[PDB]
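Q: What does the assembly look like in three dimensions?
Context provided by user:
Components: five
Sequences:
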Amino acid sequence: DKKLGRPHPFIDPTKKKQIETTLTSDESWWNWRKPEKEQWSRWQRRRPDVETVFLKAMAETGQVKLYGKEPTLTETSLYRARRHLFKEERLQAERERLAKEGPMAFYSEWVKAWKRDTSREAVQKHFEETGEDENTQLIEMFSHQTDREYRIMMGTDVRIKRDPLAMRMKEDQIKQIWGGDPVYPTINYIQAPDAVMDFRGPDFHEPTPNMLSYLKENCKVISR
Amino acid sequence: AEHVRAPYNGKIKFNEDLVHPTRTRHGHPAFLCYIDLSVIIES
Amino acid sequence: FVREDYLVRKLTAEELQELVKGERKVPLIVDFYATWCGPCILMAQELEMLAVEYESNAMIVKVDTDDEYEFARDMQVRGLPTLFFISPDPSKDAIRTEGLIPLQMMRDIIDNDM
Amino acid sequence: VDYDDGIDFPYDDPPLVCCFGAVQKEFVPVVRVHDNPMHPDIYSQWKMLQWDPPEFGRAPGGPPSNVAISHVRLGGRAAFMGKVGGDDYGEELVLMMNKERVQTRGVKFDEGASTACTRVKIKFEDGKMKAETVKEPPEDSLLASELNLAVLKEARIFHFNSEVLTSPTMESTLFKAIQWSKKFGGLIFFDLNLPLPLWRSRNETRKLIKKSWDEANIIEVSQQELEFLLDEEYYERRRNYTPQYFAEDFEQTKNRRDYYHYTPEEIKPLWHDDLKLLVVTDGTLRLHYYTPKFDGVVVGTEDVLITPFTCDRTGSGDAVVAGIMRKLTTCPEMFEDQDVLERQLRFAVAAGIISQWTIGAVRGFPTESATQNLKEQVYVPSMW
Amino acid sequence: VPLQSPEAIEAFKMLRPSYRKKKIKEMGITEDEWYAKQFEIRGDKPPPLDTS
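A: Here is the predicted structure of the complete assembly.
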């Protein structure tokens, strides 16, 4: 702490901090008492933030450590202030993994159909017979890449520079950005395109009669 | 009127005999003071 | 004249006994809806569409089991939405169907089983 | 006599539930006379009867396939055990099951019968019209030799509902399935969902369901079903009573709805030695629970006027039952810790509530995430 | 206003049950006896019955 509180992550208040005991209920004015039952509030539930999901994913990957299992609002505000540092650090680790593994082993993440060995040693040992240099092997590997895999890989485009973590967060984690499925089910909102409205459905008024037809029916207007 | 707000979590400490009892505009009991009062916050 | 908005005709249990005892030219579909029942909002629309599609080639009628509950029980109804398809030939057994069957299953029954 | 699968791997993490009986697209068995009809022809007004509904219809149950779908969508695993016709509609129902990821290895496929179609002979007796079944539908006619014993082996809860008791064949098959499941250590869940014929008289239904009820380890009954199996009129007088001069406590002055909590002595005619949990459901508004060791009530809620146009009560009881099974299979302390039981039953409450907010049952069963979200938004954190 | 009446200052102090506890201990009346005594008739008790 005292040393190495510069650089690395450390508890903001120093460890061994003191704690205090205060007025219990019945020592306090009625306006400064905690109620005898915890009151319902719309705000009772921690707001789901992008910064919480990312800071949890960084904690589980060990890039960061947190005081508890859930990132505080202070920690998420600091992530909000500093996320680009961790993003560029992850992108740099991704460039370095590219340099180490070589393009076959790196980009084979997005070619599930490419079953062959992609290590630099295997690429060399394949060049030493098939005559295909590393580039022709890479063209072939990408020739096995499906369109959907290619669109996912396009996150690695040198102009996009999509976060290596955002490319690999799974659904049950990304869900925590908005806070899981909506409580009111979206199937209530979903409507098909080219659906034609059934104006006889149960959420329309009964068909309005033709005014002349209605007046005639009620014997208010006569024909002959 | 400006509101003074606690800059830290902790325990408020002051000698409440230095200040007069009053009822606030909201009916809350409060102390009304006509001195420079020092309030500790044991954080 | 203003043309009535609904074709499926509500019957009492006695008017239904009359309609089943008398000779019929066409299949008789009896719907045992009840007005508090959620699926019956949908069944009433399916039956209205059937009642248009078949015109006079089918007699589609309905019996509110709020009113004719003991008759529904005697019809061996065990739930709603339920439907009887009663053949115009009185020798054949009637078909009871349970749940929201597809309108195509209604057409199948009426064309091929009645 | 024994059955061996030849496999030793521990099955899979969310324990399987088997739901036995019939499958219909949506179908309300519990029907009784209601005081308020809306217009007989304008279906545009029957929303008023899904937001101020009959008390027996406040949270309708349905087919056990609804419970299978809801349980799978709440994250569990369900197998549906039953029979369907070889016709297009039996295929549609099996496709509905499969698309909902309900396991259909016990779903047989009769080729010579027409799924929902029951043959009945219309007869006249006492001058009244009557029907008698000439042929039972596929879903009523699953044989005891058509049970999938691998499912009954895997399944930790065997769920059934009393509609199977309306078929003698399905009743015999049910009791064979119960024997098999109990042999494989299963728990028997009996969602009563009394169909119309079983509301005729208390003392006939009580003996009709007697063997099923005494086989069940876990039972779900609506308030109206319990009060019908007990003295319906006594509990009517119980709640229509109002003190002549003064109330015996302040709360009795407030004239609020009577959430009467049946005592264990009143349940005692129905209690039995195998019964691990009885749940009496008063809509989603309350779940009373009873065990050999403690009883209590989970206070729930509903809202349905929040969605006046899209609300529909149908399947809310199936989603409640599915949530109960979903927690029972993954938190069996429910049978032993009262706070745990309450906290987990509040998940069933939330699932029922979400299930009330859309037209259609299968369309409306919530996911696990939506249910837990609603729990944590409705309930104070102390009581999550 | 900053409260001036002795009785209103006393009521302000009584707003804490701990102060009520201390008043109980200082007067020596037991706290259930004080909870009873708060229901005492506020004044002007009628002249005793002389019934003959």
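Follow-up: The longest helix of chain E spans residues 17-27.
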